[PDB]
Amino acid sequence: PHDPSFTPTQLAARAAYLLRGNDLGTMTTAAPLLYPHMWSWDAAFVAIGLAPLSVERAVVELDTLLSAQWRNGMIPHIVFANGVDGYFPGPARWATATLADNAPRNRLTSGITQPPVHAIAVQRILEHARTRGRSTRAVAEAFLDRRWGDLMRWHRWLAECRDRNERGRITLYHGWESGMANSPRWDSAYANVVPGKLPEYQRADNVIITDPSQRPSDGEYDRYLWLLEEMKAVRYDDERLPSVMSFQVEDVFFSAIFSVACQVLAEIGEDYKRPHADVKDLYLWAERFRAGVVETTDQRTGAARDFDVLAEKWLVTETAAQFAPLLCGGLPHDRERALLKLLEGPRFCGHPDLKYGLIPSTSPVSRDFRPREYWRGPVWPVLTWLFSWCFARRGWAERARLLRQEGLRQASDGSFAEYYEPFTGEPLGSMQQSWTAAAVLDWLG
Amino acid sequence: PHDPSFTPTQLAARAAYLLRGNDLGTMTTAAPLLYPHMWSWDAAFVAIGLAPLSVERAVVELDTLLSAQWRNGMIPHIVFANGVDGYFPGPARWATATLADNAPRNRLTSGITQPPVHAIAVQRILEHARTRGRSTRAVAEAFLDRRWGDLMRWHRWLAECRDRNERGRITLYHGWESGMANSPRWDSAYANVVPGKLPEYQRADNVIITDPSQRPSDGEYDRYLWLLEEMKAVRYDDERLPSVMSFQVEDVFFSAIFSVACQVLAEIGEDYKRPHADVKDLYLWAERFRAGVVETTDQRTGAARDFDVLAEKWLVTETAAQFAPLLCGGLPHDRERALLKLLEGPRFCGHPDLKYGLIPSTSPVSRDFRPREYWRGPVWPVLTWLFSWCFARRGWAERARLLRQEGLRQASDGSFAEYYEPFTGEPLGSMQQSWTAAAVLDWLG
Amino acid sequence: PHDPSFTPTQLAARAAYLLRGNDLGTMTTAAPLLYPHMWSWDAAFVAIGLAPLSVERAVVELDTLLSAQWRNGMIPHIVFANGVDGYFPGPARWATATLADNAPRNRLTSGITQPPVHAIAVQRILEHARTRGRSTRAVAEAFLDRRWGDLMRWHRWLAECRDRNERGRITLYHGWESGMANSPRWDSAYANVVPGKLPEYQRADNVIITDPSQRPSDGEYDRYLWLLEEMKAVRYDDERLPSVMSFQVEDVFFSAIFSVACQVLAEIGEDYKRPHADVKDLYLWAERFRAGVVETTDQRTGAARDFDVLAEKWLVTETAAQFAPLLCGGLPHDRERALLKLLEGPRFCGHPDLKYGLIPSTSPVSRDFRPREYWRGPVWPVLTWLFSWCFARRGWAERARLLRQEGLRQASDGSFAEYYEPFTGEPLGSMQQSWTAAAVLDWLG
Amino acid sequence: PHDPSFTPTQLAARAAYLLRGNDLGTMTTAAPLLYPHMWSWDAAFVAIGLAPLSVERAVVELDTLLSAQWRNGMIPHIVFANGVDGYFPGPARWATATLADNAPRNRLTSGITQPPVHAIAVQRILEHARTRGRSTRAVAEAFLDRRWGDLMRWHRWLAECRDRNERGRITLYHGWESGMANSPRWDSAYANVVPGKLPEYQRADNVIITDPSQRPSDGEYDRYLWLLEEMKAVRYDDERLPSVMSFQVEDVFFSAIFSVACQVLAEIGEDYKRPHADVKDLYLWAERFRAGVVETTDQRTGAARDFDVLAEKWLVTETAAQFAPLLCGGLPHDRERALLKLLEGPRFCGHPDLKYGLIPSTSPVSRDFRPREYWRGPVWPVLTWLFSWCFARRGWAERARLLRQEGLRQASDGSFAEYYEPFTGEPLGSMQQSWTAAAVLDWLG
Numbered sequence A, B, C, D: 001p002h003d004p005s006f007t008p009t010q011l012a013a014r015a016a017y018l019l020r021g022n023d024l025g026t027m028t029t030a031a032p033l034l035y036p037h038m039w040s041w042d043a044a045f046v047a048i049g050l051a052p053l054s055v056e057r058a059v060v061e062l063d064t065l066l067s068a069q070w071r072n073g074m075i076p077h078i079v080f081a082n083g084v085d086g087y088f089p090g091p092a093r094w095a096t097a098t099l100a101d102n103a104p105r106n107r108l109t110s111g112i113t114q115p116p117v118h119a120i121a122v123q124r125i126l127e128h129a130r131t132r133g134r135s136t137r138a139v140a141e142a143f144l145d146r147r148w149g150d151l152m153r154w155h156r157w158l159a160e161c162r163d164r165n166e167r168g169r170i171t172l173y174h175g176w177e178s179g180m181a182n183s184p185r186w187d188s189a190y191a192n193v194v195p196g197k198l199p200e201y202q203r204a205d206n207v208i209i210t211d212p213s214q215r216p217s218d219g220e221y222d223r224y225l226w227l228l229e230e231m232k233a234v235r236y237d238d239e240r241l242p243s244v245m246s247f248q249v250e251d252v253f254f255s256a257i258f259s260v261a262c263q264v265l266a267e268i269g270e271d272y273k274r275p276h277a278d279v280k281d282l283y284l285w286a287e288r289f290r291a292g293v294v295e296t297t298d299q300r301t302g303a304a305r306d307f308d309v310l311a312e313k314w315l316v317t318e319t320a321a322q323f324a325p326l327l328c329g330g331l332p333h334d335r336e337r338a339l340l341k342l343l344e345g346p347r348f349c350g351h352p353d354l355k356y357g358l359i360p361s362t363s364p365v366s367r368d369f370r371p372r373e374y375w376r377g378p379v380w381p382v383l384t385w386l387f388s389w390c391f392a393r394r395g396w397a398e399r400a401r402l403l404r405q406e407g408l409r410q411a412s413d414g415s416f417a418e419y420y421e422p423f424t425g426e427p428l429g430s431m432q433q434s435w436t437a438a439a440v441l442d443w444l445g
């Protein structure tokens, strides 16, 4: 009618209603239909959104994810719900159950990883639990007792197996591992992926999201699915991926997230008297990946570049990933001021046509910008949340507040959209996306 | 810790989280374990609590309840969840499936009724829907098209079959039909219930609520269960209940609720162009039961009395039911002022030991008062909500606001208790009670 | 930036900041410059806005107004601030200090009256005081002791001297007494006001509001000032005014306000044990003016008409005054439904081009509608407040809530404008208008 | 009644009402009667509280303070209101108008200084102005143009004249300069202050605060006033004070504030293109005083010590000043963790008897603790605000949020007390204290 927005209490109520509605029992789907399984970094954001509602159930969410952790420490990016269809590529296509010696016996999972935001969710659970009294603190502390080792194995696998040369950057073998498979970041690396005899398949994602402008193309999916074939042919063996994979990139945004997560997990380890050797290793990785991120940065603007390991070239694109060094710190004073100027100026948050003062996934002034197309332009509430939380942690209280305020204004339609059109504010992707509700729940306090 | 209360957004979020958690699919249980089925007047309050979250799902809740309506128009007070145990008396004990010719074929139900608050829930659904735009208005209007006749049959059954002498008061054959089975209101009528050979049974309610001070006694349950035997022996036939039932009371609070509900449903009928004959009948019943309520009232204080049909005597007790005339109107000016003075004074809301300025189910100064014992004293959030809504509808904006404010203060522990100790505020009865969350959700706006 | 609206806490703070800034010490100006004096019904609304801030200062505001009461009971519509210029007509033009035998010795005032909303402010003060404990209740009760007699003499002067024929409607001798001097309501009465030798004058209002479209015309001010000459010629004598005034109208909106105010003051009198004869007179007047308002109404639509006493003619116009019967009650059921349909429909709150669901001062479809011009069309926050408060007192809780919600949305720019353009929401008239801040303060709670 | 607390909107409104009520025109008194003049660091906090209400008036507050700046750059701690009495020592006792060659011609002031929080207020003004559009940004930028040089001269006077030896700590000649004249911090320095012939005087502070337990003793005031005699004897000459003053201490809390203020002002200078040499000096001083603060700290616990320059002795006490290093940064990792453990533990925020999780001015377990006595124990809302703002700037978002939440809980009585009893929450000192209202206004947002 005259304004279809919701009040803060109405919005918080609807966000919690959604998150419980996507709960299958011990895992929350990332969306009702498009993503009807557990996703790894979504599950961390879901736990953040559950923490104000039930510390016990937030802990269950991470327990379920960690129960699917591979024998070598990798957290796979999908934990499939038993008997659930409607998502492709599904467990039959990954075939990790029959081909991956490290895959868990009692869960079906994908064969690739996703960004290590999980320590941040643990910190939010602990902060909520400490406000709730003894029995709730005991729940969160029992979770640490039970899962500290698994969290360490996850970070160690990243540091040792995806940074084999100790360059302080994480190597990815699939664009899906960045969280942003169709980002302009990866276009030139995908151009060097030439599928062989790719087994026939039918997409499911664009049956649910039928507007073709909102999802990747068939040609992109052919390359996404071919990379799976290459992993399967070597049975997902870490030692063989560098020799066979047609896509090998160092992801500077994933790397900065890992730097932050190591520092966060290290602080948790000190607070809860975890083994000193573990805390020492976490701080070492935090510093190594901070330095690895800074090494990539533009000498004028501070913007961070990804790296194509096969082509041996810096990937220079105009996306939100450029702001990786803002997450983890480490830039010299003058270059971080330049990077913040880029963030706030007309190429990103200050673009004059934006409905909200938020960070588009791709700069609206880039030739690669597509305002509807998944990670090629739309504004993602999950990125707003991650940037706002990391900015508050840098001490940039007012910058963080402004992102939270605009994110709540954007979410006040109650669509809990996966992403939003940057100019019109139209909800895009899946509606009722779990991590969009989780951002709103964490923000509203 | 220093204050374990929740903010308004945290509380609204937790209330919605609870209501979705008690949703079995198309019905919401009244509580997780103590009441693991659909109850009739609880379902109306659940629909009120769902309306800010999903008009579609609020409508589903009433559709499910009305699908269990008996062939003669009676809405039974329990609609059992298929395959669910843990509540006594359960479907086997009622035996309406085999003995009640009017019971629905496709639902298991109890054999008695409960207060007709359902029109009030329809009004709240309609008010929410009108703020939400065309598609949501169409959902609520389709519900009226589908269920107006059933709602009329429900009111007609009450008016014709439970007020056979057109006295403007509803006759009950079980204390459970009042919603308040152990109220001091009914003690002298129960004293005239003498069980014959009562089939052996085991309670379930005091397995879940083990503190004996919070639930009725075994002796009370023996009388509750014997009344079932009397109904079963005549196969729940309306025409035979007056000849056989050992408990027959005119419930003045139920009667006042019915007066209000008739007026509310009549206004809905006018607004949505329902049949004129129906609207005329609803207004006639609204006036008849208003007059029936006023006829019972104390000539000094305005307090309303129940009536024992078998003993032919006015039941004079000191409970919240005395305030029935405040709900429906009709008292002369001077006597309603006296009744409000009683409400606000030291026998009820103004009692000096109360933690919150709320209406205890029994006056703390009555010899019958028990601060823990179900309907014999505790403060019930559902009654706070009903009184506050009816008071706002009388035009008593500040009185209604004060009840809402104290009700939210009391509920801010997030226990969503079934009822609360009036002096200490201790949560009692079931935790996570659906209609307590619904009151909070409606209030918070 | 992207959103120049204030949060509820920011807006409440700015509203209180404004009200204290317009405080001269013991009186609050109606605006900083346009209305740099105390106005009568503005002072009632200011007291309502002060009640949540300081019951003591709210009481002072009404004490200051009543200290200016005329010896016959009239509350004049302007109490001039000593030594303050910049408003015309000012004290020298009214000349009540030399001509009006009933004017107070110690205050400079105008010589006409304004609507009796004062009892409503007393109710709000009492309601706040009762939530704030004994010392604050004592302040408000002491005000009742000190000023009950003055309030009675105000209501009695209205009932006996402006309703000489006991028709239950208030006669006015100036459009300014209606609050709405350029309302289309008065156009045909003004058309029979033929000025004689009118002494020269210079307007001050359109020096401060320079946009000519927002204020009445010079021709209209000539008639406003000529009526002052007619009053002055008979020394403002109540007994002579009917013989000489060229403007004599029965104001149905003023009459409905008076009915409400009498009923409100009667209930205060009952609650605080004021003399029985006063309470009885107040209820008698409430009923008399309720009936007088109903007598004006169209038998189909319920719309209330004003009456031109000199022409002996019903004044049929399409302004917010038509809704007078909604404030005081009394209409038959069918007629009130019809009037509510007019209010909510496309001629008023339902007009498709309105920015906010609010009541414009003149219907946008009326030929007399002017969207910028004072009382000929703009939306007035003070009317929104008065309608919402009276609607809640009728029991129309949702209708009242919707007006409050839209009024807060409109006021969220922080301009505290006198009135707003109905289609664009542009702030018009004076900024920093005291009764717009008071409405916001009362609403926000 | 049952709950005398105010809602967030009511509290924000009352806080703004108070601040406007203490406004004399161009200066805001620190309290209505106890402190009926402008105080220096109070005026910074008042400007912070005014920024959400009127950027223009917030700027006026700092313009008025800086118009009283001494010719050598010192901002004096009191700017007296013309013709206002009731505070002692007043202008005649200081005699700066006749004795101090650097005192301003057009203002009566004291002859000592106070902590340099002023840059923090400038930052908050700028942050508000940037959310309010171009005309308001122009007001704040014009203030920078007009007053940047004065702010530089204030910081330069501190750095060059109160840190003559470039030790990175500020020397004080009076306990009043610390803000906390009766803090246990100064007891051993005061013990070596031996008054000579002290001219007779009559205290005013304990006429307004009559409870002797809330204010310093007569013996303490004799020493405070004797230090004024020593300053007066040398005409307040910066060059002579070290030779004559019986009280000379390095204040580590003042020093940490100065470090923060320099860094804040440097970032403002970079953002608004102020002279490079100024920005460079500001960063140099920020680093120098950060290091000077760290040099004072216990190597185990991180607790910061003050220094008695005359005794050449570290002053080891248990007050909130120990936490100075948390404001400015610089501690080694292990030492800062230890200091945070002290802050959160049973000697401060964790003490089991505190009503609120807040920082008392003296540790409750210290032998010097007095729960009512000014800076010897009470909880000061202004310190809560300063710690919370600095903590958020460190990146400690949850720690800052908890202080704000508890500070708002404590302030929800609406007394706006100067300080509060740490165990009972009783309001103490002056009511209606301006910087307590300003803290609430900044927090509520």
Ligand SMILES: O=C(O)[C@@H](CO)O[C@H]1O[C@H](CO)[C@@H](O)[C@H](O)[C@@H]1O
Residues within 6 Å of the ligand: A030, A035, A039, A040, A041, A042, A077, A176, A178, A179, A180, A205
């Ligand atoms: O498009 C897909 O099929 C999945 C595959 O992982 O990715 C999207 O969907 C996932 C589930 O929300 C997210 O984790 C990703 O970041 C991404 O937005």
Ligand SMILES: O=C(O)[C@@H](CO)O[C@H]1O[C@H](CO)[C@@H](O)[C@H](O)[C@@H]1O
Residues within 6 Å of the ligand: B030, B035, B039, B040, B041, B042, B077, B176, B178, B179, B180, B205
């Ligand atoms: O005690 C019980 O077993 C049930 C039987 O109907 O009654 C309570 O529980 C029901 C479910 O909440 C309520 O509808 C009733 O009013 C009452 O409080």
Ligand SMILES: O=C(O)[C@@H](CO)O[C@H]1O[C@H](CO)[C@@H](O)[C@H](O)[C@@H]1O
Residues within 6 Å of the ligand: C030, C035, C039, C040, C041, C042, C077, C176, C178, C179, C180, C205
């Ligand atoms: O235009 C004027 O000069 C005055 C004359 O009384 O009226 C307006 O201004 C007055 C003060 O705000 C209001 O009381 C009136 O209702 C009206 O809007």
Ligand SMILES: O=C(O)[C@@H](CO)O[C@H]1O[C@H](CO)[C@@H](O)[C@H](O)[C@@H]1O
Residues within 6 Å of the ligand: D030, D035, D039, D040, D041, D042, D077, D176, D178, D179, D180, D205
């Ligand atoms: O006690 C006094 O007379 C004054 C002297 O400056 O100090 C208090 O009062 C001043 C004004 O509130 C504060 O600035 C101080 O920090 C302190 O609390």
